[PDB]
Each structure stands twice: as structure tokens, then as C-alpha cells.
Design an enzyme around this catalytic site. Structure first.
Site, PDB file in Angstrom:
ATOM      1  N   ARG C 107       0.867  -1.182   0.000  1.00 53.89           N
ATOM      2  CA  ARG C 107       0.000   0.000   0.000  1.00 53.89           C
ATOM      3  C   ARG C 107       0.893   1.217   0.000  1.00 53.89           C
ATOM      4  NH1 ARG C 107      -3.174   2.461   2.935  1.00 53.89           N
ATOM      5  NH2 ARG C 107      -5.371   2.328   2.318  1.00 53.89           N
ATOM      6  N   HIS C 134      -7.295   1.435  -6.404  1.00 52.99           N
ATOM      7  CA  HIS C 134      -7.584   0.934  -5.054  1.00 52.99           C
ATOM      8  C   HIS C 134      -8.219  -0.437  -5.168  1.00 52.99           C
ATOM      9  CE1 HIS C 134      -8.906   2.115  -0.668  1.00 52.99           C
ATOM     10  NE2 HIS C 134      -8.176   1.011  -0.713  1.00 52.99           N
ATOM     11  N   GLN C 137     -10.268  -2.115  -2.133  1.00 54.70           N
ATOM     12  CA  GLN C 137     -11.595  -1.559  -1.872  1.00 54.70           C
ATOM     13  C   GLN C 137     -12.564  -1.920  -2.987  1.00 54.70           C
ATOM     14  OE1 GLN C 137     -12.425   0.080   0.964  1.00 54.70           O
ATOM     15  NE2 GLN C 137     -14.559   0.094   0.270  1.00 54.70           N
ATOM     16  N   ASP C 232     -16.884   9.373  -0.933  1.00 57.23           N
ATOM     17  CA  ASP C 232     -15.752   9.366  -0.016  1.00 57.23           C
ATOM     18  C   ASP C 232     -15.465  10.821   0.355  1.00 57.23           C
ATOM     19  OD1 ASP C 232     -13.625   8.419   1.597  1.00 57.23           O
ATOM     20  OD2 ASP C 232     -12.531   7.495  -0.057  1.00 57.23           O
ATOM     21  N   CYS C 274     -15.954   4.100   1.358  1.00 60.77           N
ATOM     22  CA  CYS C 274     -14.709   3.606   1.933  1.00 60.77           C
ATOM     23  C   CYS C 274     -14.481   4.314   3.257  1.00 60.77           C
ATOM     24  CB  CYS C 274     -13.530   3.897   0.994  1.00 60.77           C
ATOM     25  SG  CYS C 274     -11.873   3.400   1.656  1.00 60.77           S
ATOM     26  N   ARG C 320     -13.845  -6.194   2.893  1.00 61.10           N
ATOM     27  CA  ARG C 320     -12.423  -6.045   2.615  1.00 61.10           C
ATOM     28  C   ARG C 320     -11.662  -7.298   3.055  1.00 61.10           C
ATOM     29  NH1 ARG C 320      -9.961  -1.425   1.697  1.00 61.10           N
ATOM     30  NH2 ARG C 320      -8.329  -2.012   3.208  1.00 61.10           N
TER      31      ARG C 320
END
Lengths: 334, 334, 334
Positions: C107, C134, C137, C232, C274, C320
Site C-alpha cells: 500500500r 484501489h 476496496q 468518499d 470507503c 475487505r
């Protein structure tokens, strides 16, 4: 013992005297089993989160070993990032964590944080330390006291907290006296006493259970008859450094030294202290404070007491791990 | 091999040549077993602490994998907090850790710290790195040298440390020569030589064991006959940045490049280097230093040597894990 | 499913629609198995590295639980140290890690970093987050969408990203539409649209697969018919604080509130986000921004929507872990 299953452990007053007795018996069994090489793992397949908002580097050790011994896996989340409730609400955090983990250990700030974690996670949450209470240390001390006074009920023991008793450990001892009937002496300057309302509440409870809670500045009457003298550091980093001089001036008469131990009149009195302790010049900070405030030889306890045969601080420190383990086993395994 | 059980590993000179041979044989067995999918776990149920006072983010990897492969659990305690001995004395810390953990790996500062941990913890303590020695890297290099010169004794090998040999790895190589009879060449400016007294002591020992230790500024005679040329970075963050210019001016003639490799007169010479290495422009810091001091193409080693067939740095890096594992297995399992 | 074995997972476009379907079926199986107490561990003996250059304290939890559940061990390497490529090149780091670990989760920053890790490590590398994508996600959202619209193909669904769609999640949704035929609406001010070239490429692909990608500032036509509305946060720490005022001024009309939900004309529309979300005053930062910019009641989503029955953010957050686990199992076990 079955009453612990799937429950949180947020403070001692959430439990009965009989439940505490059963918990400490479990801790003693787990300690014996590990010493004898016959520990039976009850937590295989469990994932535990350590939410340590307030942390020293060493703090995680007792919790990880307890979990590892019992077969669980651990995710440590330390104080390097932002506090919980900075970027994400406590309720949101609790809901997410509770779907991932089987149990959550918390060390941090206000008691309301750990109550909210417990309420919204749906899994056992264990309070290691908050502003108000220090349950993990209290359980370790109680087990240590039993081990060194075998066959005595807590309502047959006298415990002294010398020094600054106005803190989460003082509160936890008030609870212990309330619940178990301990004879508890807070031997301290009046400015370093726990809050009067909590003292009055626990004193009413303690009386009912055959105990008593005394707050006094007088060392000779305070420590007379003590089975145990506990103390902890007098100054903390965070409280302003310019207040240290007046705090030390107030507290230095309350140093646990050979004189205070002899004033108990009890040759078998033992000494307790949540580590770390400033007892000699072998730390950079302790050596600086000893030089700046005139405390060579030890601050809140002298090196002589700390290293004496009466000192049981390393048994106490080890017993953090066994009692933490008992909490995890009692609440996660049926 | 039985002589390792429940002992610490604090420096190479605490062991005999025969013990070192047995340790490296164990590392080679563990490496083969894992490669062949038949590793037998000897450390199930053991809890190991990593006390890494000096740390890079990647440093913990070889130690954790070694423990995990062998079935142990690990608690990593990193350099983000305060140093040991800041808030709690080393002796106190050792006593607490030794009741919690079966073994302790240390990486940090003075050798006396790791000696005190070993003395007061009551469990094996393994020195990964101190100011004085780098035992973990030394063992990895020795295994790597055996693998690339099969069937040769160390007293049949010639090892060169080029560059700044005044550091913990230079000291560990002095010990290796003292104990095994290695032909060791420290090829370096005189200001970058290890301390004369330790050199004289190890030189007397090395002579007795069929080896020799040479310190010389002359590259051509220094590297002649080498089986291996080792080097490491010339400047470290912490040493003042304004000293870098004179250090680089002193050391840049000692760069390991194709010319130095050819001066050995040995077509099979191999190259070693404790990672990380500054060998190209593909790091922010390496690119800045290359531009500021005129070292495009590599600092202490050129990209050409570093990527050449003679370079065995990634075998060396992998062998940290296998030799760490051998130390843990030899000292914790009977 | 066999096509995943020993492969990396760097972005959705590296896979076919059929492979994605099989991956999400595996995630659903693993989720059911764990809920029913019959999870079968496929990763016993595997060591996984978490290279989290960009990190919040909580981020590691889903990855560690996924690995732990499956029997693997984890080494977490967080963002406290220096970035990869500061002191050691990415290629060098990849080569070392790949000899130690069976799989690597990344990440961080640029996509080229994770491509280089994948190319030079020799083991599966999984992209949790980069500047460009991403994937972790996205997989969690796709599984969550399937669970709440059982028996529907993605090319039968309409997904809205409201707010600032110019970011790695917007790009991942473009890929999802390209590959699966999703009806994707980016409902956003024109300055907050993903890059036109990637939009044009994915739009050509999406058309071929029975889908469509619409970018529009018009909320009423944008959200009409939506099965899901995702959003988000509008501002991030790092982007300069003095730009927040104009960004909030631009984005506040795009708040997901009860009005926007009703404008879909779909009583069963669900809400995704998220985490973390700024939906009330129960964070220090959210309360400050609410007061400074006039957003009490919630920023990018109102507390009412966030806590409504339509909100499925905590199912999404849990998913997740199940989809991360599916990636690890599919790429490490045959």
C-alpha cells in the site's frame, strides 16, 4: 466462571467478589500449568486486537504472550498514529473492529471510550488502562497478594498505597476494597487523594463487606499493620515540568524506604510497585531527577527497599501476564 | 552442538572454532530443509522478543521469518519509543522480559547493554548488532563464503574488507580471523582502521590458528589473492553531514570497482556487502550524494560490480535468515 | 481459478471478467465458511509481508485477520520509517523480500513501485492501494454489491460515485465498468473527473461489454436509476489546507443526503463509502471542519443517510477482509 463468557472486563465493580475469586483461581491454574509444561490452549483460532492509545514500548509484551500461549493471534495497534476519535468516530471504529476480531484489549484515555467500544463492537472488550481505572494492574496485584499470603481472604489483608494515590490505580484499589473487604490505607498528602465521592461510595460498600478505607497524611498510623505497601512514580511526563518541584516537595516524605517498612511493625510486609520504578541512578531520567531534586538513592522507593527480600515487584510484573490470560480465557472460551 | 543449549550469542569470541563449524552446518541443514519443503519445526510454543533499539523498517524481516518458520511467536519492540535505560534500568527490563519470553534478540548500542540483558534475563539473548560487533551479519557472510568455496576451511580463504573498516563489522571480522585462521585484509585509509589493541589481540590469536590479519592502505597488495571483497557504505546519517566531504575524499579511492576486482588476480573473486548498498541513482539519498560528491555510477561499489556475476549480495542477505534461525534453534532446542 | 496461482494482483484490468467472477465466488465461500465455523486453512506455513508505505493505524487489520484465519504468519512494515527507494532501491528491496516471504501486500504511492516489486520479487505481490488504483476496496465493493443484489450480473447494475471522483477509486471503478459492463455514473464537478484518456479507454471497453460510463455534473440525471451510491471524503490532509475552502464550496452540492437518495427513484438504493466517513460531529477533525465550513450534520454524507437502513458501509468494510483473503488464497494455494 460461566458468568464471564462473552462479557467485557471494563472495571472491577462490574463483577462480584465470587466472580473475582474464580477469575484469580483461573489465573493461578494457568500460571501453574505453564510452569509445569502442561498449558492447554483454549484460544486457538481467535484473533485479538490491542488498541493501545497510551503505550510504552514494553507494554504490549504481557498481552501478546498471554494470547500467544493460548493459541490466539494478535494485531497490535499502537499510539504512533492519531487517537481514536480523531478521524473516525469511536462507534464506527468499534463496529468495524468487532466484525474482524474476537476480542479487543484497550489502553488509553477516558472510560467512556472503552464503554463505547464494548457497547458497539459486539465482542469482549477488556480495559487494560483508562484515566479512571487500571484493572490489568489491579488483578496482577491481587493475585500476587494471594500468592504471598496463602489461605487468607482479602478481607484479612491490609494494603497501603503510599505517595500520590490520586490516579487510576488508587481508584481501582478503592473498588477492590469496596468489593472484597480489604483494609485499604491511602497514605498520602491530602492533595494526592482520590475524589471524595468515589471514596465515600466505596467506603460504604467496603464497610458492608467487612473492610475499611482510610485516607490519612500520617505515615505511622497509616502503615501500621500493613501486609503490603504499594507505590508508584511521583511525576509523569505530560504534567508540566515546572510543577515537579512542588509535587516532589510535597511527596518526598512519603518515599517507601526502610523506615516506612519498619513502621508497619510487620516483619513480613511486602513491597509492590507498577513498573517502571525510579529506584537508583541507572536510568537517564532517574539520574537527572535525582540530581535536580536531591533524590539520589531512589525516588518513590529506595534502591534498598526495591532490591530487598520484601520486594515482590517482579512476581507482580509477571502476574500481569497470567491474569490478562485469565481474562481472555474466561471471556472467550466456554 | 549441545554446548549451545540455553546459552546466549553475544559475540563470536565466546565460541570455539568447532562450535562455529557446527552452527554453520546447522544453518546449512535448515536452509536445505526449507528449500526442499521438509523443515522440521523445533520452536513450537516458544515466544521470542525482538528488542531493536536501532532499526530500519526492513531489519525485523529475517528474524521474524526465522522464528515463524520454526513455529515460534514473535513480539517486535522497535526504536520508535525511548531507549532502554531511559525510563527503566536495563537490569529491571531484563528481569521482566526474561519471565515473559523464551529468547531475546537485541539490536542496539553498547555491548554492555546486551551483556546485562544476558546476565539478568535468565534466557538466551542473541546479539544482532551492537556498537562493537555485528554477529548476525558475520554468520551470514561466513555461511555464504562456505557455499561459494565448498570444501575449503576458513583458514584456506582470503577475505578483504575495503573502505571504512573501523566499525562493528570490521571488529567481527577480526574475531573471525582470530578464531578460524582466515587470511583477513583490511584495505582502508589508516584513519578507517579498527582499534589497534583489538587488532593486536586478534592478530596473535589468528597467527596461532594458521591465519593472518593485514591492515594496509595499499590496494594492489591488499586485495591480491582475495577470495572475497566485502564493503559497506562510507557515510552514515548521524555522523555530521559536514564531515561527509572529507570522508568521501578519503574513501573514494577505495571504491570496489572492476579495477579492484581485477587487481585480486583471481577470476573467481566474489563480492559481499551488508545491504543496503549505494550502487546506482535509484535511491533518493544515493542520487543526491552522487550529484553532490561526484559519484554517479555507484558510491562504495559500482553498479557494474554490484550487478555482476561475482556479486553474491542477495545470497548473503538471504543467509541472514538461515543463520539467525540456526542460532535460535541451537540455543532454544535440545 | 487456477489462472491466479503464483500471479500478482496489481489492478483489475490484469484479469478477465470470468476470473473476477471466480475470485468473488471464492470470497463468498470463505466468508460463509468462517461464519459457519468450518473455514479450511490453505496458507499454513506461508509468511506474508505487509509493505504499507501509506497507512492509517487501523489499515493493517483486514489484511492480518485474513492471513491469520488462513494459517499464515504476517510481518507488518509500516510508514513510520523512510519510504522504499529512499535508502535502498525498489529492485534491491524486492529481491531481498522475495527470498524471505511467500507473498507481499503493498500500500503506497506510484503504480510503478508495485509493478517493480512484482517483477523482481519472484512471489505474488498484491496491490492494496496506489496513487492510480484501489483494488482492495474495489473488490470489497463488488462483493457487497453482489450480496445486496443476488442473482444480478454486474452488467445489470448501476453504480454512482458522487463527489470527487478524481482519485484511485474512481479509476478502479472505470476499470470495473470496462471489464464487467457496469452502468457507471461519475456524478461530480468537472474539475473532479478522472483523466479523460483513461475514461475514453474504459468507455470503449465498457460499451463492448454491455455497459456505459457517464461523467456529469447534473445530479438528477446522474443518479437516476442507481442501485448504489458511493462517496468518499472531499478533502485530504496533505493537499494544502488553504485549498479546502474552494474544494468544499465546489463539492458541497454533491453531498449524499436523503434528497440525493430519493432522486434515484429507486426505493432499494444502497449507500457505500470507503471508511472513514465524516458523517457527524463525533470526530475532532469532523467537528472542526463542520464548524469551519458550515457542515454540521455530515460532510460528504449526512448522518441520516450514513445510519439509515440503506447504508451498507459496515458490510462493505467487513468484505475487505474476505476479498483480501480470496486474493491471498487464490494466488498462494493450488
Amino acid at each position: 466462571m460461566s458468568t464471564f463468557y462473552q462479557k467485557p472486563f471494563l472495571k472491577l465493580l462490574d463483577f462480584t467478589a465470587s466472580e473475582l475469586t474464580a477469575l484469580l483461581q483461573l489465573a493461578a491454574k494457568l500460571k501453574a500449568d505453564k510452569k509445569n509444561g502442561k498449558e492447554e490452549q483454549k484460544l486457538v483460532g481467535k484473533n485479538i486486537a490491542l488498541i493501545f492509545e497510551k503505550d510504552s514500548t514494553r507494554t504490549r509484551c504481557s498481552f501478546e504472550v498471554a494470547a500467544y500461549d493460548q493459541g490466539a493471534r494478535v494485531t497490535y495497534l499502537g499510539s504512533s498514529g492519531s487517537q481514536i476519535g480523531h478521524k473516525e468516530s469511536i462507534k464506527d471504529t468499534a463496529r468495524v473492529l468487532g466484525r474482524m476480531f474476537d476480542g479487543i484489549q484497550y489502553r488509553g484515555y477516558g472510560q467512556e471510550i472503552v464503554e463505547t467500544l464494548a457497547e458497539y463492537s459486539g465482542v469482549p472488550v477488556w480495559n487494560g488502562l483508562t484515566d479512571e481505572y487500571h484493572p490489568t494492574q489491579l488483578l496482577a496485584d491481587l493475585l500476587t497478594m494471594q500468592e504471598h499470603l496463602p489461605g487468607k481472604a482479602f478481607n484479612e489483608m491490609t494494603l497501603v498505597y503510599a505517595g500520590d494515590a490520586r490516579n487510576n490505580m488508587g481508584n481501582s484499589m478503592l473498588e477492590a476494597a469496596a468489593l472484597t473487604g480489604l483494609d485499604l490505607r491511602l497514605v498520602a498528602p491530602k492533595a494526592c487523594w482520590p475524589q471524595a465521592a468515589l471514596v465515600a461510595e466505596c467506603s460504604a460498600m467496603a464497610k458492608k463487606n467487612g473492610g475499611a478505607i482510610t485516607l490519612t497524611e500520617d505515615i505511622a498510623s497509616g502503615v501500621k499493620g500493613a501486609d503490603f505497601i504499594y507505590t508508584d512514580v511521583w511525576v509523569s511526563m505530560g504534567e508540566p515540568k515546572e510543577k515537579w518541584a512542588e509535587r516532589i516537595a510535597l511527596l518526598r516524605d512519603y518515599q517507601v524506604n526502610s523506615q516506612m517498612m519498619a513502621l508497619t511493625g510487620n516483619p513480613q510486609v511486602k513491597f509492590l510497585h507498577c513498573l517502571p520504578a525510579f529506584h537508583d541512578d541507572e536510568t537517564t531520567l532517574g539520574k537527572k531527577m535525582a540530581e535536580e531534586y536531591g533524590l539520589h538513592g531512589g525516588m518513590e522507593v529506595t534502591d534498598e527497599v526495591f532490591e530487598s527480600a520484601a520486594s515482590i515487584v517482579f512476581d507482580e510484573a509477571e502476574n500481569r501476564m497470567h491474569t490478562i490470560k485469565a481474562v481472555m480465557v474466561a471471556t472467550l472460551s466456554k
